Amino acid sequence: QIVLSQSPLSLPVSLGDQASISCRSSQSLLHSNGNTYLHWYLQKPGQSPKLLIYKVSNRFSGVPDRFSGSGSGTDFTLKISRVEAEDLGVYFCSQSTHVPYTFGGGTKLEIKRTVAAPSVFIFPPSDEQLKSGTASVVCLLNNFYPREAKVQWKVDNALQSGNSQESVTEQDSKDSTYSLSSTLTLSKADYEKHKVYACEVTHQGLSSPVTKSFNRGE
Amino acid sequence: EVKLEESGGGLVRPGGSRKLSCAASGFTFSSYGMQWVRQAPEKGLEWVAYISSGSRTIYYADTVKGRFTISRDNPKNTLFLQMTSLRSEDTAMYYCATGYGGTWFAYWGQGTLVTVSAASTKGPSVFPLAPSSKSTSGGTAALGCLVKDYFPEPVTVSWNSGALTSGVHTFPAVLQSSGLYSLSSVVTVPSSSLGTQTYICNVNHKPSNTKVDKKVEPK
Amino acid sequence: KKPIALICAELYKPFQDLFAALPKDCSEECQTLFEDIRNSESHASAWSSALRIKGVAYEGFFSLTNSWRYIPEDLKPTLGMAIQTVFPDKFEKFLERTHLHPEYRDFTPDYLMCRSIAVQEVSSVSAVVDRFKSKSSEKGRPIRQEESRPKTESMQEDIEVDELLIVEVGYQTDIEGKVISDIEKWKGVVNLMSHLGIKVNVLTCADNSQTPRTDWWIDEKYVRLLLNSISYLFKELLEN
Ligand SMILES: [Mn+2]
Ligand SMILES: [Mn+2]
């Protein structure tokens, strides 16, 4: 199969700056008919993909003229001359010269904004869930930038593993921050054998790692 | 205006079968090749199949060969994907698309979600994430709902019947090892409004026809 | 017992029916050939002439059935001629790549058409391919079929390319052997066409006298004409 290799995997860019995304093909995309079937798409969060550029450099009708494409053979580039907030999303190249048609892995365009440390909040399990025999503890990192964050659970100062899951929002369309939830799930029996529940957060906007904790009884 | 409208998605047991349709309008359907593309949750795009205008040329991704059949009915402006021997890896949003003049994907439908799983349809349990001093920062308090153990996807979460939208973060669901899904929804509000404003998270899970209204209060 | 000339006399009407129905140039060739049989001295001479009538007539009825022009062997284009006039910008590379197989340039199929010595024009290559694949799938008739394909290239909808259709036909007892040998002979040039980026389809098929009359590659009326004429002639030459 033709392998399409996109770089970078994610592209932070300030509003108004140019973005450049590269697509490298494992073999020539020049078709024997003379055309080169390399195309560019944008998928905005929660929407279906949209065609931007077809056959290397043809802007699809109605696409903003800030988008353009260039290249030949195995080396292709999509340029956004002046990034706007609407350009947030995942950019894909794809080729239809050869069967199977194939896609690049995607380049996430991220809107650059000033650093924002997370607000860190913790939620003990509700009594209603405890009545059912399970205890979920939720740690919330709200409205932070950039995306890189480390979140770990400690229970009576013992590090947890294998019992927590984390979820991250897409970059917010208005303020360009992320939010993240980390959920620790214990049995009710296990939850009542311990006192201190603690979420430890590392983020570059903080002067040092922040531990948010509560005591089960209080 | 060109429009492609998929239907037929839903829940299928592994090994089962499902037929998708795509109704095309706004152009002369019978003159153009049509395509299916899919996208597994949180993953990239993967091409599925191509069918020429006169159905003479058909191509398939290698992962669907022998299991999927693409076809069309030009007088009825309809494209089909018959899916068989489905596996959990076929769980995805299925899009029909056309180049309207080429093999690129110029027009896309809104997609239809196919979930392949033996898990049983189940409404969520909804638990409050109550505001407290551990969830307060300055004049701001966070609160939320934990939406636990539902199946299949989607669930929709609103706050105060949609009136409260500022500061709402509804997290993407995580597929648990149990086979069920879970997510939380949080919102930050003025801490001054606690005890005067009622906060209700509205959880709608159409696949199970369950709707839950959970009021979230200080503890 | 019967002299060869007397054998031709009794078959006067069947062979007149045959000549009346074949295309002009095809009919004259079969008529000349028939007179060679009538005047033949040796049994070998008569047999060889009859063989050629069998092939030439069948190809005349194949042309009529498909509304294609019948082309005498002498006027039939070679592959080389097809590449030179249909794909002139690739003829040089065609020559270079046939250095080790120069016989490829001289391959002369029964029909050498291109999409709309001269290469004939056909409105749709894929329609012809489909017709063959349908009858093969419906009456179990052996065919072989191959299409050039550069690497793993997809067909495309935004541009048209020139293409060739190469067809081999025949009337002989070993139908499976005929189509197997034809496709093997052309597999080399198909591979070459793939490397030149030239789109070609090759099709081969065959009929014999045991084929059900409704199932041939020629109209059933033409089947009765051949059976009543050349086929009976072969039976009479053998007995006598
Ligand atoms: Mn011949
Ligand atoms: Mn022949």
Automatic annotation (TrEMBL), chain C:
<protein>
    <recommendedName>
        <fullName>RNA-directed RNA polymerase L</fullName>
    </recommendedName>
</protein>
<feature type="compositionally biased region" description="Basic and acidic residues">
    <location>
        <begin position="136"/>
        <end position="154"/>
    </location>
</feature>
<feature type="region of interest" description="Disordered">
    <location>
        <begin position="136"/>
        <end position="155"/>
    </location>
</feature>
